[PDB]
């Protein structure tokens, strides 16, 4: 019997179709998170920096993962129709490049009951054509109940939800539920991120406690609408003020993933090499409210630790907006040159 | 002297960067226009249908063209900050396929003063790696003046406009104005669309006057938001109800290009072969209003003419929504089997 969410921990499935990383999509995603690092844009500079093509922004993986995760949240995670992102971890085992063809899987890797609530973590891995895991994504959400929101939210949402169907794996996606687990393991993690020469700041120029310069990002309703289409996030909390209020927010709120992407761009603008960020972990705090006049998010940070053996460091990243703390604890692990 | 819009007719520029057509973007665009023809989705079926990969939906070209056309409408077309799409023509000289790498140019091909108004036509051509024009796009807009709209629209628009910058050709895009024309011609038009074997309906099964079955498309605010990001259209008339009203509309309105894309999918669902539509010409009428509860657009059509020599026909396409006529005269020229 697998009637309970708790009993379904370990549920695993693979997408039948690969995901081909395209050059123009890399640029489009970079644009959507206001990331202008040349490695995401310019072929000649990407080559100068040792890449075989443009590399993806760190949080790019959120877009194909959300598509893959539809069955998990619709059919597998029973008990909830609505979710709130609380935490994300991005592991960049090697930089993803234009022309990568990735096999994506989905695993319900934990369900934890905390303060009457369920914290639900879904893990995706991205495997390349050499059969190596190039990226691991951990998404944690809390389950939201009917009692958390105005009942009027459901007809409102039905009224605005997009209609476009993802025809890929649409049969397997909508099949009846039955439990499946990950086959017996030994996955091979890509080592390229650890062995490549970083194009980041020189390790020896750094000190523990060094502050990153403060960066102000501007965020508008149009940024959110653009991100919704580019990243394939259909949730109207990010563009319908009425529905956002029915959900108990004071106005439209930014995608959690978007504020994380702006944070990754903040880190790579400072460090110099998007490919050198091997881990990025963000706990969210308060949502970033985006009114019709627009808002700002201020990113800041400092070096928490340095390791001279591996010439790596950990940076704490902070984000604040409209009088609110947007990030809780957030860190980036970075390889330096 | 080129101070006047009229004197600038013939203005021409090329994008420095090619545009690489990606497999997943083809799928994403198809999804955005609710087009589920297998040639846009399934690799094995696309092969069965004689294609070397997925082919693009007919109106796919609108997305890269809009990016290219930024300089034309911002810096070249002087006198107007705001435009209304009135007419489009798509010429599919051969079907665009995943992996195509296209060189795009931009030409101000006519400015016509009609009833105190300027009808402004901008033509794009898409040239492949064999130096052949595979697609020609003609976009006609009418110039909209400050007096056509509530003055409050400008601060409102400023408040919501997206920030993400297209770094490609950003220097040439923002350079001072100076007139340039198309070099001395002889362009080579791709003949593949004319010589390939169509996978459409058999010509001999058709009759002049035959009605296409009526199709109801559903359109929601979320469809429009998704299209805005997927197609890179930053205009808030398609997702901000306040700004739409300041623009004199009764509510949010659908992208003209989106209603045209739904029309192309309607035609190819009937004809059987998206690649067989060699020309698609649409004059718009009234905008499709999209309220918070959603709406419908009804597509209909009939065979206008048949040519047994080339085994082609012309179909008239009609579209109506919320009590309004959405299309004026609209036709598709189709090769039959």
CSV table of C-alpha atoms in Angstrom, one decimal, chain B residues 114-280:
chain,number,residue,atom,x,y,z
B,114,UNK,CA,-3.2,56.5,-45.1
B,115,UNK,CA,-6.0,58.5,-43.4
B,116,UNK,CA,-3.6,60.6,-41.4
B,117,UNK,CA,-1.8,57.5,-40.3
B,118,UNK,CA,1.5,55.8,-41.1
B,119,UNK,CA,1.4,52.2,-42.1
B,120,UNK,CA,5.0,50.9,-41.6
B,121,UNK,CA,6.2,47.7,-43.1
B,122,UNK,CA,9.4,46.0,-41.9
B,123,UNK,CA,10.6,42.9,-43.8
B,124,UNK,CA,12.9,40.2,-42.4
B,125,UNK,CA,14.6,37.5,-44.4
B,126,UNK,CA,16.2,34.4,-42.9
B,127,UNK,CA,19.2,32.9,-44.7
B,128,UNK,CA,20.5,29.5,-44.0
B,129,UNK,CA,24.1,28.1,-44.2
B,130,UNK,CA,23.7,27.4,-47.9
B,131,UNK,CA,23.0,31.1,-48.4
B,132,UNK,CA,19.4,30.6,-49.3
B,133,UNK,CA,16.4,32.5,-48.0
B,134,UNK,CA,14.3,30.0,-46.2
B,135,UNK,CA,11.7,32.4,-44.8
B,136,UNK,CA,10.5,36.0,-45.5
B,137,UNK,CA,8.5,37.8,-42.9
B,138,UNK,CA,6.5,41.0,-43.5
B,139,UNK,CA,5.3,43.0,-40.5
B,140,UNK,CA,3.0,46.0,-40.9
B,141,UNK,CA,2.2,48.3,-38.0
B,142,UNK,CA,0.5,51.6,-37.7
B,143,UNK,CA,2.2,54.3,-35.7
B,144,UNK,CA,0.5,55.2,-32.5
B,145,UNK,CA,0.8,58.8,-31.1
B,146,UNK,CA,0.8,60.3,-27.6
B,147,UNK,CA,-2.7,61.6,-28.3
B,148,UNK,CA,-4.0,58.1,-29.0
B,149,UNK,CA,-3.5,57.1,-25.4
B,150,UNK,CA,-3.8,58.3,-21.8
B,151,UNK,CA,-0.6,60.2,-20.8
B,152,UNK,CA,-0.5,58.1,-17.6
B,153,UNK,CA,0.4,55.1,-19.7
B,154,UNK,CA,4.1,56.1,-19.9
B,155,UNK,CA,4.9,56.0,-16.2
B,156,UNK,CA,2.8,52.9,-15.9
B,157,UNK,CA,4.7,51.1,-18.6
B,158,UNK,CA,8.1,52.3,-17.2
B,159,UNK,CA,7.1,50.7,-13.9
B,160,UNK,CA,6.6,47.3,-15.3
B,161,UNK,CA,8.9,47.0,-18.3
B,162,UNK,CA,11.4,44.1,-18.1
B,163,UNK,CA,15.1,44.9,-17.5
B,164,UNK,CA,16.9,42.0,-19.2
B,165,UNK,CA,19.2,43.1,-21.9
B,166,UNK,CA,19.9,41.3,-25.2
B,167,UNK,CA,23.7,41.5,-25.2
B,168,UNK,CA,23.8,40.4,-28.8
B,169,UNK,CA,24.8,43.3,-31.1
B,170,UNK,CA,23.9,45.6,-28.2
B,171,UNK,CA,26.6,48.1,-29.5
B,172,UNK,CA,25.3,48.2,-33.1
B,173,UNK,CA,21.7,48.3,-31.8
B,174,UNK,CA,22.3,51.5,-29.7
B,175,UNK,CA,24.6,53.3,-32.2
B,176,UNK,CA,23.6,56.7,-33.6
B,177,UNK,CA,21.4,56.7,-36.7
B,178,UNK,CA,22.8,56.8,-40.3
B,179,UNK,CA,21.1,55.5,-43.4
B,180,UNK,CA,22.1,52.2,-45.0
B,181,UNK,CA,20.5,50.3,-47.9
B,182,UNK,CA,20.5,46.7,-49.1
B,183,UNK,CA,23.5,45.8,-51.3
B,184,UNK,CA,22.8,45.1,-55.0
B,185,UNK,CA,20.6,42.0,-54.9
B,186,UNK,CA,19.8,38.7,-56.5
B,187,UNK,CA,18.8,36.8,-53.4
B,188,UNK,CA,18.4,33.0,-53.8
B,189,UNK,CA,15.1,31.7,-52.5
B,190,UNK,CA,15.1,28.2,-51.1
B,191,UNK,CA,13.3,25.8,-53.4
B,192,UNK,CA,12.8,23.0,-50.9
B,193,UNK,CA,9.3,24.0,-50.0
B,194,UNK,CA,8.3,23.8,-53.7
B,195,UNK,CA,10.1,20.5,-54.5
B,196,UNK,CA,9.5,18.4,-51.4
B,197,UNK,CA,6.7,15.8,-51.3
B,198,UNK,CA,4.0,17.3,-49.1
B,199,UNK,CA,2.5,15.1,-46.4
B,200,UNK,CA,-0.8,17.0,-46.6
B,201,UNK,CA,-4.3,16.0,-47.7
B,202,UNK,CA,-4.6,14.6,-51.2
B,203,UNK,CA,-5.5,17.4,-53.7
B,204,UNK,CA,-8.1,15.2,-55.4
B,205,UNK,CA,-10.1,14.8,-52.3
B,206,UNK,CA,-10.7,18.6,-52.1
B,207,UNK,CA,-13.4,20.9,-53.5
B,208,UNK,CA,-13.6,24.7,-53.9
B,209,UNK,CA,-15.9,25.9,-51.1
B,210,UNK,CA,-15.2,23.0,-48.8
B,211,UNK,CA,-15.5,24.1,-45.1
B,212,UNK,CA,-12.8,23.4,-42.6
B,213,UNK,CA,-14.2,22.0,-39.4
B,214,UNK,CA,-14.7,24.7,-36.7
B,215,UNK,CA,-12.0,24.8,-34.0
B,216,UNK,CA,-12.4,26.5,-30.6
B,217,UNK,CA,-9.1,27.6,-29.0
B,218,UNK,CA,-9.1,28.5,-25.4
B,219,UNK,CA,-7.0,31.6,-24.3
B,220,UNK,CA,-6.1,32.6,-20.8
B,221,UNK,CA,-4.0,35.3,-19.1
B,222,UNK,CA,-1.4,32.5,-18.5
B,223,UNK,CA,-1.2,31.7,-22.2
B,224,UNK,CA,-0.4,35.3,-22.9
B,225,UNK,CA,2.2,35.5,-20.0
B,226,UNK,CA,3.8,32.3,-21.3
B,227,UNK,CA,3.9,33.6,-24.9
B,228,UNK,CA,5.4,36.9,-23.7
B,229,UNK,CA,8.4,35.1,-22.3
B,230,UNK,CA,8.7,32.4,-25.0
B,231,UNK,CA,8.5,34.8,-27.8
B,232,UNK,CA,10.4,37.6,-26.1
B,233,UNK,CA,7.5,40.2,-26.4
B,234,UNK,CA,7.9,42.6,-23.6
B,235,UNK,CA,4.7,44.6,-24.3
B,236,UNK,CA,2.5,44.9,-21.1
B,237,UNK,CA,-0.7,45.3,-23.1
B,238,UNK,CA,-0.8,41.5,-23.1
B,239,UNK,CA,-0.6,41.0,-19.3
B,240,UNK,CA,-1.2,44.2,-17.4
B,241,UNK,CA,-5.0,45.1,-17.2
B,242,UNK,CA,-4.3,48.6,-16.0
B,243,UNK,CA,-2.0,49.5,-18.9
B,244,UNK,CA,-4.3,47.8,-21.4
B,245,UNK,CA,-7.1,50.1,-20.2
B,246,UNK,CA,-4.9,53.2,-20.3
B,247,UNK,CA,-4.3,52.1,-23.9
B,248,UNK,CA,-8.1,52.2,-24.5
B,249,UNK,CA,-8.7,48.4,-24.5
B,250,UNK,CA,-11.5,46.9,-22.4
B,251,UNK,CA,-9.1,44.4,-20.8
B,252,UNK,CA,-5.8,42.6,-21.5
B,253,UNK,CA,-5.5,41.7,-25.1
B,254,UNK,CA,-3.8,38.7,-26.8
B,255,UNK,CA,-0.7,39.1,-28.9
B,256,UNK,CA,-1.6,39.5,-32.6
B,257,UNK,CA,1.2,37.0,-33.4
B,258,UNK,CA,-0.3,34.5,-30.9
B,259,UNK,CA,-3.7,34.6,-32.6
B,260,UNK,CA,-1.9,34.1,-35.9
B,261,UNK,CA,0.0,31.1,-34.5
B,262,UNK,CA,-3.2,29.5,-33.3
B,263,UNK,CA,-4.5,30.1,-36.8
B,264,UNK,CA,-1.5,28.4,-38.4
B,265,UNK,CA,-2.0,25.4,-36.1
B,266,UNK,CA,-5.6,25.3,-37.1
B,267,UNK,CA,-4.7,25.2,-40.7
B,268,UNK,CA,-1.9,22.5,-40.3
B,269,UNK,CA,-4.1,20.3,-38.1
B,270,UNK,CA,-6.5,20.2,-41.0
B,271,UNK,CA,-4.1,20.1,-43.9
B,272,UNK,CA,-1.8,17.6,-42.2
B,273,UNK,CA,1.6,19.2,-43.0
B,274,UNK,CA,2.9,22.4,-41.4
B,275,UNK,CA,5.7,22.5,-44.0
B,276,UNK,CA,3.2,22.6,-46.8
B,277,UNK,CA,1.9,26.0,-46.0
B,278,UNK,CA,4.0,28.2,-48.3
B,279,UNK,CA,2.3,31.5,-47.6
B,280,UNK,CA,0.1,32.8,-44.7
